[PDB]
Amino acid sequence: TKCTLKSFTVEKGIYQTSNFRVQPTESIVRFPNITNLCPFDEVFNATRFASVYAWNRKRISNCVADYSVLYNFAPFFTFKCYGVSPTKLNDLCFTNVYADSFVIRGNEVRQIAPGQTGNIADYNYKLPDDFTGCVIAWNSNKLDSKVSGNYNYLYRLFRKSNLKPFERDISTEIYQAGNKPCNGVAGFNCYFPLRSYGFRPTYGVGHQPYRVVVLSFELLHAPATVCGPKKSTNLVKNKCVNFNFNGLTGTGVLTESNKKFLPFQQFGRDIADTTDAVRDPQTLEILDITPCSFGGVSVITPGTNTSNQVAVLYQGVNCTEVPSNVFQTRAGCLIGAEYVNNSYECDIPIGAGICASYQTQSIIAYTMSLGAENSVAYSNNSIAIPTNFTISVTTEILPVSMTKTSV
Amino acid sequence: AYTNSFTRGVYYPDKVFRSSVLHSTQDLFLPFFSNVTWFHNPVLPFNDGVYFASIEKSNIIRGWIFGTTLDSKTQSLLIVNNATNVVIKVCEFQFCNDPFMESEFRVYSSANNCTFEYVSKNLREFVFKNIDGYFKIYSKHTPIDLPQGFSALEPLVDLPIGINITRFQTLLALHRSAYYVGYLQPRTFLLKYNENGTITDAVDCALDPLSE
Amino acid sequence: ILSRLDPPEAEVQIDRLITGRLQSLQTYVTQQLIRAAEIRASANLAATKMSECVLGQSKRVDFCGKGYHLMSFPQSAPHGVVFLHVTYVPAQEKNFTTAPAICHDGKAHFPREGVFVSNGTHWFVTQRNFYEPQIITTDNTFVSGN
Amino acid sequence: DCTMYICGDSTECSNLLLQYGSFCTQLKRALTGIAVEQDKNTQEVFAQVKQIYKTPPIKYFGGFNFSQILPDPSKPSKRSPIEDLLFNKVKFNGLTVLPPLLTDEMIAQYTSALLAGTITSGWTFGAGPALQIPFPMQMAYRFNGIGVTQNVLYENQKLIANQFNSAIGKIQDSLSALGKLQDVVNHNAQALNTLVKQLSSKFGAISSVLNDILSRLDPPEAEVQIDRLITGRLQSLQTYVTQQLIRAAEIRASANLAATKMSECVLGQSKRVDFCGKGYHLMSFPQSAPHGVVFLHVTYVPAQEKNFT
Amino acid sequence: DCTMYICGDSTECSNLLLQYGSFCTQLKRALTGIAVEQDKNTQEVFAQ
Ligand SMILES: *[C@@H]1O[C@H](CO)[C@@H](O[C@@H]2O[C@H](CO)[C@@H](O)[C@H](O)[C@H]2NC(C)=O)[C@H](O)[C@H]1NC(C)=O
Ligand SMILES: *[C@@H]1O[C@H](CO)[C@@H](O[C@@H]2O[C@H](CO)[C@@H](O)[C@H](O)[C@H]2NC(C)=O)[C@H](O)[C@H]1NC(C)=O
Ligand SMILES: *[C@@H]1O[C@H](CO)[C@@H](O[C@@H]2O[C@H](CO)[C@@H](O)[C@H](O)[C@H]2NC(C)=O)[C@H](O)[C@H]1NC(C)=O
Ligand SMILES: *[C@@H]1O[C@H](CO)[C@@H](O[C@@H]2O[C@H](CO)[C@@H](O)[C@H](O)[C@H]2NC(C)=O)[C@H](O)[C@H]1NC(C)=O
Ligand SMILES: *[C@@H]1O[C@H](CO)[C@@H](O[C@@H]2O[C@H](CO)[C@@H](O)[C@H](O)[C@H]2NC(C)=O)[C@H](O)[C@H]1NC(C)=O
Ligand SMILES: *[C@@H]1O[C@H](CO)[C@@H](O[C@@H]2O[C@H](CO)[C@@H](O)[C@H](O)[C@H]2NC(C)=O)[C@H](O)[C@H]1NC(C)=O
Ligand SMILES: *[C@@H]1O[C@H](CO)[C@@H](O[C@@H]2O[C@H](CO)[C@@H](O)[C@H](O)[C@H]2NC(C)=O)[C@H](O)[C@H]1NC(C)=O
Ligand SMILES: *[C@@H]1O[C@H](CO)[C@@H](O[C@@H]2O[C@H](CO)[C@@H](O)[C@H](O)[C@H]2NC(C)=O)[C@H](O)[C@H]1NC(C)=O
Ligand SMILES: *[C@@H]1O[C@H](CO)[C@@H](O)[C@H](O)[C@H]1NC(C)=O
Ligand SMILES: *[C@@H]1O[C@H](CO)[C@@H](O)[C@H](O)[C@H]1NC(C)=O
Ligand SMILES: *[C@@H]1O[C@H](CO)[C@@H](O)[C@H](O)[C@H]1NC(C)=O
Ligand SMILES: *[C@@H]1O[C@H](CO)[C@@H](O)[C@H](O)[C@H]1NC(C)=O
Ligand SMILES: *[C@@H]1O[C@H](CO)[C@@H](O)[C@H](O)[C@H]1NC(C)=O
Ligand SMILES: *[C@@H]1O[C@H](CO)[C@@H](O)[C@H](O)[C@H]1NC(C)=O
Ligand SMILES: *[C@@H]1O[C@H](CO)[C@@H](O)[C@H](O)[C@H]1NC(C)=O
Ligand SMILES: *[C@@H]1O[C@H](CO)[C@@H](O)[C@H](O)[C@H]1NC(C)=O
């Protein structure tokens, strides 16, 4: 009070000096679930993969993508990601997620990469120079290699000119290296263009069959598409904290409501268009949002020339949310004064019929009186007439002028 | 023929629940007491959204076709509903010029490059609009020339397609063994909500000086 | 601003300060006009009391002090006026029995001014503001009705 | 609260408020200085009696029936049957409403004490001690004060009591009007709503939300745009305060008139033409209203003139 | 007429002016409130 008034002597009265202000605890970010996990489950588990020269191609759609099963899978040998980091796969959003899969020899995985050369990367599968995808590749000896030779997987090693990025060529036209046209017969300078990896379990690393999958994103023009997954954090109630309901950011106390939304509405607003209720995405229950507990703080003083005792009123603050003599009034919680049952003339007005005084010493605070009471001795044939009088003098004061200023 | 709408083509402008609150909204609606064309067929324009009502206990309407060219060489939307449920689909099609045992589906003969799949008297109202690449559909089926009354339409789908639309057609079930087409304009209404949160009345803020 | 900045940018910085301090003057002058209307209303009340409390006798209740107005004396105060209000206050009442009229010769007599009182055994006429009884005569009363 | 209106729980904005000086000091004092006067306005109208007077249990005054203006011991709190019509007919982001000092129950007793004094003691309690006098004799004095002899009342006492009792009973029909009280509530409510709605203006910034600008932009630029929001919102808030001072003077002017009528119409008999109702003033009775006072003016009106030479 | 003073029938200015909220509604209400009382002031002095 002294600091607000800029003085060291405060006169008796009541002074507004500051403000209460309840603070929120914890930060809960709520959401729904995942619904459609858009099943990566098969492109990484397809029992019959495809030979490299005719490689399969699966395109993800609007879905929920949870890459945590990939990174945390635990059984890999090569996982390199070029466009975006391996951990930020769950906070971005892309339009079309293409997924390629095939099998190749061991020491050729160094060729599934932007800007390489060799009999495999040249013309079987060409990644561009501005790749943005994510390459995963592991060993699959025990699943795809069968003793005696498994001659299913082919790989082209003859072609006119190198491939184009993301292009595909499956023809079986007989090569022609010489000058004499072939007429489709193998032999001298007319070679078949397809060979086969003969896998066996008794091979060294670098020749056992590896399985390779590559992801590739591209954001053509869509407004929004498959993004990363949301997240949790237990939901508490009756504790004004910091909340987020799938985009709705705010502060306040969450409580069970009694409103009934329509079966398509997420949240409600009050008059003047401020959000006052939401629906929990997971449990589908309506919760009201009330503001915390802020308010002014006033200091009640008898005057520094009387005492240095003081009581404090927290305006419209409940007496359970403030952090002796605690008194609840319709104007807030009064602490540091007692509540008596007598009634005096008002001295320091608090509000709603309550006043404070320095009488009974610490500091107290009762009801408000209304003055003395008196019955007039009325009857139907009685009169009262004065027999004497006094002359009284009283003052009245009125202002008439101010100082004249000019700027 | 042409008919006179009364108070039709009012739909929930958005989510957001609400109670007794005379809320004012600006959006694309079918104006009250408007001039709606009548059909008993040819390619119709789109220009900005479509109102589509109909009346009949049986199901004569067997989907719609939307897009810019209504032909091959470019992608288009196709909405059908057999006795199972609604099937949204967005591919490049080749549509019959006259699309329509008990064997059916002679509408198209090509379905390339599909970018979206989905499977699962009487008045059947629809509101179609296409904003920022989103194709919205509102609908409601209420049992009983159209009558006179008010009924707000709720969202049905949310389709992140990207498709452009300038024209569309309709599909009918022929006999081998009636519908309306309005369009939407930017108008302002004053919407009355009940305590359950539904729209019970509306005022068209561009009709008569009293409405202003 | 100029000492450490070129004109092209100094014009913007000075224009911001000018706008801020010009807003200060608008706030100041607007409040002086609103507050001058209040002191003017007070000066009108003081001028009205000067006429009606000092240059005459008022019957307006509580306009010239508490009690029955007799007279007032002005005093000068800095930027104001002080009124010394002289009032008449009755004191020390007694109760009496009363009646609206008196019958004599079959006729009703009413007081010209005053009230009828009884001291317990005899009735008198008194004036209403000071107890001063006189005998009820035909010169004190008038006749009207039966 | 200027900080919660302008910034709204934002530390970047709160520190920027320090560059504007003492604007919040002016805002708090301007609104507080006119809030204190509002309790003074109600004390000067109703607290014009030192004692709390009561009527006798034998509510019957020369034939006059006052039961519709006196408290009725069987109602919410303690209102007259007529005051019940008067009361029955009528935390966002810093915008706080303070309660009045006097409750409606406290105003009702002030008004019931004024009513008891004028019925049992006439106009004597306002110049000293309350002096009892029977009511029929009070009304005869009041006729004398307007130029009518007193015998005209005493020979027609039953007629005047019948006419008064019917005239009072017509008041409840006219009430079951108060626009002078409803306008005050509506004008302030519309100003509070407008103040909130100015929180969705850009004032030449890119976004209206302080947690938006600073987050996606550039701090050096966010500071200039946040200062534009602070300036625009401060100007809105200053406009609010200026209009409250202009409106506070209108309420005080009305409260000064209501206090003047209380003394000159209820605690006495006035000769001022039209000041205490239309006709020759006899008496007045106060009634409380939610944010005001209602006076019942009783006047004498002559009728049925004849021609003479 | 708020718009005609500030912008003077210019679609670029008038569209930017909308970004300031409803100041042009407050100006009209204030002027209407004091323009109605001008007839009330005259009516109560002479219609006696
Ligand atoms: C989102 O997923 C949760 C599970 O993670 C679903 O919770 C189920 O809700 C039903 C009632 O609707 C309960 O009977 C189940 O027991 C819940 N499951 C669990 C594991 O608690 C929730 O319903 C899903 N939300 C939607 C909209 O489908
Ligand atoms: C990938 O394939 C393997 C085998 O084909 C699946 O393995 C299953 O493992 C779980 C956990 O031990 C068992 O409970 C199942 O019985 C196994 N499947 C079978 C058919 O026996 C594995 O689940 C597949 N990946 C995913 C993500 O489902
Ligand atoms: C006039 O008589 C009345 C009674 O008729 C007196 O009022 C009584 O006063 C006494 C003393 O204060 C109280 O104890 C009684 O309760 C009063 N009676 C009633 C009915 O109120 C009054 O004091 C007398 N006046 C004078 C000057 O003596
Ligand atoms: C009216 O009141 C005054 C006092 O205010 C009375 O005057 C006093 O009378 C006593 C004797 O009773 C004297 O001793 C005092 O000196 C007087 N005071 C003054 C100032 O002169 C006066 O007598 C009272 N009148 C009646 C009739 O009782
Ligand atoms: C009422 O006052 C009268 C007059 O003073 C008293 O009556 C007596 O009247 C005769 C004349 O008729 C006088 O000579 C006596 O001196 C009077 N006596 C007194 C005591 O004053 C009468 O006594 C008074 N009544 C009461 C009840 O006090
Ligand atoms: C004064 O008027 C009141 C009505 O304002 C009278 O009260 C009514 O009395 C009649 C007869 O007993 C009842 O039928 C009504 O129900 C009463 N009204 C209420 C509201 O209670 C009252 O009787 C009158 N007093 C006198 C002395 O005549
Ligand atoms: C004065 O006027 C009143 C009416 O304002 C007269 O009183 C009415 O008289 C009629 C006829 O006798 C009765 O039916 C009514 O009931 C009376 N009204 C009331 C309220 O009592 C009165 O008679 C007139 N006086 C004279 C002398 O003519
Ligand atoms: C007093 O007498 C005058 C006539 O001297 C009456 O005047 C009449 O007024 C009415 C209109 O109110 C005219 O239509 C008549 O023509 C007038 N009469 C005459 C003879 O001129 C007046 O009405 C009388 N007043 C009363 C109260 O009876
Ligand atoms: C204030 O202090 C002075 C001494 O400095 C003392 O005389 C006076 O009584 C005090 N006032 C009160 C109300 O205590
Ligand atoms: C404070 O909260 C408790 C419940 O925790 C409630 O019982 C009490 O009535 C509240 N006080 C006020 C003044 O609202
Ligand atoms: C006041 O009186 C009430 C009963 O009316 C009693 O319950 C309460 O304890 C009293 N308060 C004090 C402080 O004695
Ligand atoms: C609708 O407008 C057309 C002209 O575009 C007109 O021929 C037709 O009569 C109108 N319909 C109604 C119901 O007014
Ligand atoms: C319904 O139509 C869709 C789309 O043509 C089709 O996929 C589905 O198999 C149909 N259902 C039946 C039962 O024919
Ligand atoms: C669309 O289909 C054509 C063949 O009809 C094909 O050439 C083209 O690559 C396809 N587009 C996409 C994006 O798959
Ligand atoms: C729709 O057509 C417009 C031209 O009318 C074009 O500018 C726009 O890019 C198209 N939208 C899409 C999603 O292709
Ligand atoms: C819907 O509103 C009606 C009143 O129109 C009400 O009676 C009914 O209880 C409401 N239904 C629900 C589920 O709240």
Numbering used by the authors:
A (entry chain B): 299 to 621, 640 to 676, 690 to 736
B (entry chain C): 27 to 66, 81 to 140, 153 to 172, 187 to 210, 215 to 247, 264 to 298
C (entry chain B): 980 to 1125
D (entry chain C): 737 to 826, 854 to 939, 944 to 1076
E (entry chain A): 737 to 784
Which sentences did the original study use to describe this structure?
Here we report the cryo-EM structures of the trimeric S proteins from the BA.1, BA.2, BA.3, and BA.4/BA.5 subvariants, with BA.4 and BA.5 sharing the same S protein mutations, each in complex with the surface receptor ACE2. The five sublineages of Omicron exhibit numerous mutations in the S protein, which is responsible for receptor recognition and facilitates fusion with host cells. The RBD may exhibit “up” and “down” conformations in reference to the viral surface, and only the “up” RBD can expose the binding site which is responsible for mediating the interaction with the peptidase domain (PD) of ACE2. This interaction triggers the conformational changes of the trimeric S protein to further expose the fusion peptide in S2, which then facilitates membrane fusion with host cells.
Additionally, the BA.3 sublineage is at a low prevalence for the time being but continues to spread. Additionally, BA.3 has combined mutations from BA.1 and BA.2. The structures of the ACE2-PD-bound trimeric S proteins from BA.2, BA.3, and BA.5 were determined at overall resolutions of 3.3 Å, 3.4 Å, and 2.8 Å, respectively. BA.3-SA represents a mixture, with 81.7% selected particles in all “up” states and the rest in the two “up” and one “down” conformation. As BA.3-SA represents a mixture of the BA.1-SA and BA.2/5-SA conformations, in what follows we will mainly focus on BA.2-SA and BA.5-SA for analysis. As seven of the eight common mutations shared by BA.1/3 are located on flexible NTD domain, only the G446S located on the RBD was mapped. Scrutiny of the local environment suggests that the shift of the N343-glycan in BA.2-SA and BA.5-SA is a direct consequence of the mutation S371F, which is found in BA.2, BA.3, and BA.5, but not BA. Our comparative structural study thus reveals an allosteric mechanism of the escape from S309 by BA.2, BA.3, and BA.5 through the single point mutation S371F, which is not directly positioned on the S309 epitope. In addition, G446S, a common mutation in BA.1 and BA.3, might lead to the interaction between Ser446 and Arg60 of the heavy chain in LY-CoV1404.
